[model samples]
Every structure is written in structure tokens, then in C-alpha cells.
Target: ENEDVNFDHFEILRAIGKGSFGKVCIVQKNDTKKMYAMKYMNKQKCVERNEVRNVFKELQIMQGLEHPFLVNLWYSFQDEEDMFMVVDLLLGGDLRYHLQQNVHFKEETVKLFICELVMALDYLQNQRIIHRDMKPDNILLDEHGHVHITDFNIAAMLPRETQITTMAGTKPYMAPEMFSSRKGAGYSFAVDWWSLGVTAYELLRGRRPYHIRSSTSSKEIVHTFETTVVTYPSAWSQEMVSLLKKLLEPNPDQRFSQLSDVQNFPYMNDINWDAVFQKRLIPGFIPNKGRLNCDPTFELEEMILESKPKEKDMRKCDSSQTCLLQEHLDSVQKEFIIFNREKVNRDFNK
Candidate 1:
């Protein structure tokens, strides 16, 4: 029962970040003394903005996700005013912050990130989930500097036979097909590869491949991608250029659409898939210790409790059941069993 789960179990610390719907705070379980990230969303505001579906979808997707490079949702519960979710804490902050630090990454470092992300996306696609939004902000890092994908608020779950035409995600990182979906076209997993190409280009070049004028329309942006030639720095490898060309193809049917397609690229010929699958490969970059850059001074209780309720917060919580409490916990617990079972099976085989 959700009644058994309450905010009292956690010692809410200072705010780490804030977003459109809520703020994230660093919290520690009083009994376990383990740290977590507590994110609280105002139930009333969610109803007012017609975002209840997105909120619930995020919870459902997060609960089911179990990957070394994906953030795992531990628990989700609710009260009269807010819905609370707890997730594992990562001290290394997000990739966006590091990108803004003006440090150019070596090609090897970027390759490590791409490999990790490809595997994570491969796992999600295998589960019939599409991460509509793929950007630097959604990618977090562990202390060891490995990437962990988070923020599934906009992710969509579709069956293997289905395609989605929904227009959701950041504007700049969106694929040409996403913009074309408005004209009665459907998009599939290939859209993600397009975004990946954009991300890769940005990481290496420190800017987007196609220039985005503030006054440009969607048609113009699409045209730019369709017509503009992709140029690379002279210092980059020919294999890197070839991989980007295939990934950024305007035709979804012609693009590198699957994990296998990515693996087949000459640039990926040297990668050991076995080591990547087991997470045994070393990362190329290690974030500085004690330099996570988390905001320690942002008071949490003061902002949530002391601040006056907003106009949207006046709305009542209409949902009868706010959380899938036992189901979420069971899903996580199942992973523990599977992990141990796999280890035992390996030991027996050996």
C-alpha cells in the first residue's frame, strides 16, 4: 500500500536541480543510510497542464528499465499534494554540463560514449520502447564516468510492428522524419539514429552540423538537412566520416537503422562487443572526484514547503490510484533474482 511508503522514510537534503514539473533533491534513507534522488511532482499542477499521461508513462517505462547504462527507478509513491519517485544517485552530473566546460573530447572518449549509448538504445529498442528524446542533458554519468541514460518523460512504448508519428522532443536534435511526420508520414526507431548522428557531430565539432537560423521554418530546417553537405575536420578518420554519413542520412530507410547496422560500420570494427555487453571495458574519461558540481546551497524544504502554492496547484488530484507501488518494487526485485540466477548459471557451466 502507498500508505506504507511516505516521505518520512527519507531525510530530504538540498535541491540538486529543478525542471518544468518539479525539483530534484538529494535524499538519504534514514534506515539504510543509502543516498537517492527524490523527485516530487505536484499532482495538482500535472492535472492542470494535462501532463498526467506523460508523468504516468514515465513511471511505467522507468520501472521496467533494467540496464547498466540506464537509470533505475526504485520506488514511486504519492500523497495528497505530490507524487514522489526515488532513483539511484549519480555523482558525476550530466553530459551537458561537461560539454559546456569548453573541453574538447578526444575521439577515443567520444567513441566510448557512443558505444555505451548504442548498447543502451539497443536494449530499449529490444523492449519495444523508443526514447524520443536523446540529448546531452538526458545522459548522466557515474563516478567512473560511464554514461547512464535518464529522463524518460517523453519516451514512447510501441509494439515491434508499430510506428509512431507523434511530434515530441527537442527541436534541434529532432530528425527530418519527425518534422515530416506532420505530412502524414510515420517514423520508427531510425529517428533515434539520426539524433545520435547529430549528437556525435556536436560532441566532436562543438556545434550542430546544420546551421539553425532563428527565423527558419521547419521546412527550411528539413531542406537544410536534405541539401547541405556534411563536412568534417581534416584531422578526423575516414571511418568516422563514413559512420556519420550513414547515420545522418535523410532517408530513414537508408540510414543505419539497427544496432547491427551500427556495428557493421568500419569505425566500430575494433570494438569488442563482448566486453561492452559485460561493462568490462574501461571508460575513456574519469570525471574529477569531489567535483560533481551539484548545487549544495539550494534549500529543498524551503522551496517546496515554504513557497506559496501556485495557481495551478489549486486543482484537485482526480486519479483514484496514483502509483503502482507493489508492481514497481516487484519489477526491481525481479532484477535482483535474475542477476543472481544468471551468475549461478554461469558458475555451474564453468
Candidate 2:
């Protein structure tokens, strides 16, 4: 993946993460003076391994997505040597780091993360893009703990009733539908919810809903996830337990249903969205002006609030999906232009 490193626009300061295809480098945006994590992949290796198609599928979907919770792919380019893509740099890093630090985050923080993830998932599904991957490791964090979902390598675009082979996304993060060999049975966007619930359970409880016994195989993972019902070891808050049950439901149709449906869950209904966002209690950033008179906790950022239900037709991608697709596409395009121009200048020494 060294080939994905485009030295032309940004300077690679250091290596942050690695993947089978490439490594992510901490980079400096010469024009904006912003730092970003640039993901690089080796085109030769990707093609040789027959993964280029998968990579392209993910890139196209990401190129078309626009959500605060999803990682912003600032720009991408390919050279004879490599394939390089610049993405949002989360100074704080992935969510797992925090979960590792504090096994279970404060309920409020967890809710905030869920809200962000659901909102982003809602947007992605709206665009006919299935994240396929929703593990904590793939979830990045801005300086203030805002969740940004990344890693689109295995993302797929499915038709309304399309049946997929389930070879997408990481092994552990793959959904039950993928593991099962049900012919002609199609897995809908609901797969994401299962992953999300598992992610939440893993972070808070530091364990999976299903305990993996001796052999940890895909078959075992799916069996444990499907047959073993999710139960709480101790008494959790009603809202918390309710949320988990919804997520861990065996039936995808019943599990949290859709990203928009997640909002209606009791777990998230009472959050002080305003305080959750804008990172109050942190050193910088303040509540909205109108909310200055109100408690910061009560002050909601209208711009980012999930007040409206997630429009699922968008998730399925139909005539209704057009507006969301266009909006996100424009946003990604603009950010890409900004990143590319910066890259051109840096490489040319202009």
C-alpha cells in the first residue's frame, strides 16, 4: 500500500494504522493547515488479490455519502505505483481506544456515540450503501469524541431485494446473514443494527452476547450470535437493557429495525443532544447563543439534531434517495476538491 501514498499533496508525518492492503499515515494538509489520516493501498497487490473491485465498490459508495458520523474522504488518487485516499483525521483516534481505557463509557457518552452512529448509518443506508462493517475499530473519533465511521473497503450497494454472498467486511464484524447459507434469502440493511448492538455490547460489557467456546470460527460466531439469546448479567438501566434487546434481537426485521427507528428507542429519547454535541464541559466550544440563556445541556444544535425520523426510502435508494445522495455527494466532492488542490500544490512545490 506504499503506492497509495500520494506525496504530492500532503506530507506523511507518521504511520498510525495498518491494513492488509495498506497503512494509514498522519498527513499535513499544506493548504488548510489541517492534519489528516491518509489511507494508502497498493494497486498491484489489490488487483493481484482480486480485491480491487471490492475497493472500488466501497469508494463509490463513500464518494456518494455525506454524514457527520461517517469519515470524510477528502480526496483520492492513483498512480502507477499506488492508490492513495485522504480521509478525515480524528486526532483522538478510534472508539475502541476509549472503550479500552474505560470498559464501559458513561451511559451518556454511549448514547451520544449511538446517536452519531445511527445518524450516519441512516444516511448511508439512505444512499443505498450498506456499511457491512460497523465494528468499534472502524469507528473513529474527532478531538471531542464525535464518532466518525470509516473503512469502506467491503461496503456494497444492494438492490431492494438483492441476495448477497456475504463475503463483505471483516470476519468478526460480519453479520449472521453473511454466515448463513440460506439460498435466495436476501440480507437487508438490518445487518448493520446487529453489528451496532454487538459493538455496543462489546464496548460496555467487554463481552459478546454469545460466548465463543474453544474454536473461534465464523460458524461458531454466527451460531453463538443467533441461537444464544442476549441476556444481561446484572441489572442495567431500563433504557440501556431495552436498547440492547432491540439490537440483539435475532430477527433483523425486529432488531432496532432501521437507523431512524433507533432514534425512537428509549435509550436515546432523553439525551440533552445539545450538550452531547458541541462538546460542552470540554475546554473550548460553547452552547448556541439562544441556549446561552438556557442550560447548555438543554440547548440542542438544530443543525445536527436527529429530530426527524430517518427517511428509509433513502436508505433503500429510490426516487426519495436522490436528495440525500446529491447532498452527500456534493459534500464529499467539495471536500475532495479541497484535498486534491492541496495535494497538487504540495507535490509540485508550487
Candidate 3:
């Protein structure tokens, strides 16, 4: 009769994807009948990985953030075995998914994506937040092909003193200051813009401006970034080439970091800023209809898996391993954050 959301509140539909330590499935709110992607992480595995704090930090940033170009969190809850986060369900899949299928986005389609992401990034900047990670895998698409940024686990909140100075973010997409952290000053929101440019370039060119890998050393990467001259195809429009150059600028101060910078670019003159923000500008690249956005194995495991065990008492641990798991689960149950936007809005009005 109260407002707490539990597993019973949602009807688990089907498994969709998995990444890192989390598995995502489609779920529908029993009463509202609204669908969302429920990302659940097994508490024990998360604890063993020593990255539960990062997951908690992600919730700290995501609970209140809402934007058309960002996947918003609706609720976060937990039970005995797993922690749950119900977020906007994007069936059109992520940019990486489409790219792997050899889909090369057109210049105009990529333009709309950049505009939408700019709006989201500008919003984050206003809140003193920097989305440190901006890669194709983190960018999901809706049925209409609109982009939505997700996975804020590594994002930086500028207001906090405990800013992460270590090498963060995917190597190739990261900006110069990040790799040069030991040598000079720290980084800022400019890093996201730089990554955005890399993403845009990849979408259009089917490759990145710089060739980097997970194993690439920081020294070599810094040197590569300094020495390499990015070549733009003559087939691309002049404005696109020029725009990418601004975002890929070696100096953060001179780079196109602010929303106003993008707004003032002469190449962006044709954009209807209002329409872009309102999401009225229909992109040219709509994801294919009637096809499963995720891999076939995802659906294959949906029903064959063991059912989520019903709630059990904690007085149930015997062996040392069992006792350890019980204690860990208890810590998770106590420390895990629980949120419900619907209840917040309801209480505000009351």
C-alpha cells in the first residue's frame, strides 16, 4: 500500500543485454504498464569485483538527472541477490551495435546526434558534472534514431574534492590533458567534447582519428596525439571537416567546449536550435524495424535461467562462505540507495 518499489512491482519481460558485472532485461511496471530496462547486478559478484562504490557513485549522479538525450533513471531498488536500476528502455540499441553491422551514418544524421549530445552535455555542465566517458557503446539510440547517453559510473562531479585524477575513460577517446595529468594541469568538461568529436568522426568515417587500444601506453598515446595529423576525406563537406577540427583541437582553451561554441559555429548556421532541443528534428537514420536490437543469445537465456529466488530470511547462513555472503548481502541492503521519481513528484505536490 506504500510507495516502495520491489521486484513484484515490475513484470520481468525478457533479457536484453549484459556488460561489465551487470545484466539488463526489459521490465514493465505492473500498475503503470510502462516499460523500462532493468539493469541488475548480483550483489556478491559486485562486492567481489570491488567496484560497488563506482556503481553507487553512478546512482548518486543519475538519480536526479533527466534529459531527452540521456537515459533517465526512474527507480532503484534491491532485494536479496541483486541490486536493480530501472532506466529508460531504448530498443533501437547502442551506436556500437549498429556500427558493428557495417552501418555508416550520414553527415546529416551525425550532425543531429552531435546537436542532441551537446544539449545533454550543456545540461550536465550547468550542474557542475562532467560525463567523463563518451563512446559509441555508451550512446544508445531510440526507435527514431535519437541518441541517449548512458553509463555514468565514471563521471566526475566538479564540486567534490575527491576528483579522479587517474587515467580514466577509454584511451583513444580521451583528450590530451588526461594522459598528461602527471606533466601539467588537470582536465575539465572539454574531455567530453573531445570524445564527442571522436564519436562523430567514427560514425561518419567508420574509424577514429587516432588508432589506440586498451593496451596502448600513455606515453605513446600522448606522442601519437601530438604528432599525428588527422586526415579528413575530401568527400565530406567542408563544414563537417572544419567542425571536427574545432572539437579535436589540441588545446582545451581553444577547443569547442561550450554549448555557445557550437551555437556560434558558422557551419551550424543551418541548425534550428529550438527544434533540436525540442527533439522535433527527425534524424535521417532510423534503426531498422522488425529486427532484434540485441544478440540472439540474450533472448535464448531469458527463460532457461534459474528463477530469481523468492525472499528468504537472513537467519539462513551456516557455512563460512554462506555466512560471508549473508554479511555482504546485509551490507548491500543497508547501504544501497533506493529512489522513486514518481514518489518524489507525488510528495512535492502534496
Q: Candidate 3 clashing pairs?
A: none
Per-residue lDDT of 182-256 in model 1, one digit per residue for the tens? 656888877777877888778788887888654668888888877888878889888777777888888899988
TM-score of each: 0.80, 0.73, 0.90
Query: Model 3: per-residue lDDT, tens digit, 1-350?
Result: 35699888999877677767778889999998999999988788887778778788888889869889999999999887788899999878788877787788999999889999999999988878889889999998887778899988789788744344666899989998888846546788889999999999999998899999989998899999999999899999999999999999989889988889999999888889899988898777565742344434444445565767434743786799888877777788999879998887788888
RMSD of each: 7.3, 15.7, 2.9
What value of lDDT does candidate 3 attain over all alpha carbons? 0.85
Number of clashes in model 2?
Answer: 8
| Deviation from native of the Cα of residue 263 in model 1, angstroms | 2.7
User: Comparing 2 and 3 by TM-score, which wins?
Assistant: 3
lDDT of 2 by residue, 51-140 (tens): 666666666665666566778776777654466777777776776665555556555566667777776777777787777878888887
lDDT of each: 0.74, 0.66, 0.85
Worst 10 residues of 1 by lDDT: 333-342
Model 1 ranges off by over 4 Å: 1-3, 181-184, 213-216, 287-291, 294-350
Q: Which portions of model 3 miss their true places by more than 4 Å?
A: 160-164, 181-183, 287-291, 294-327
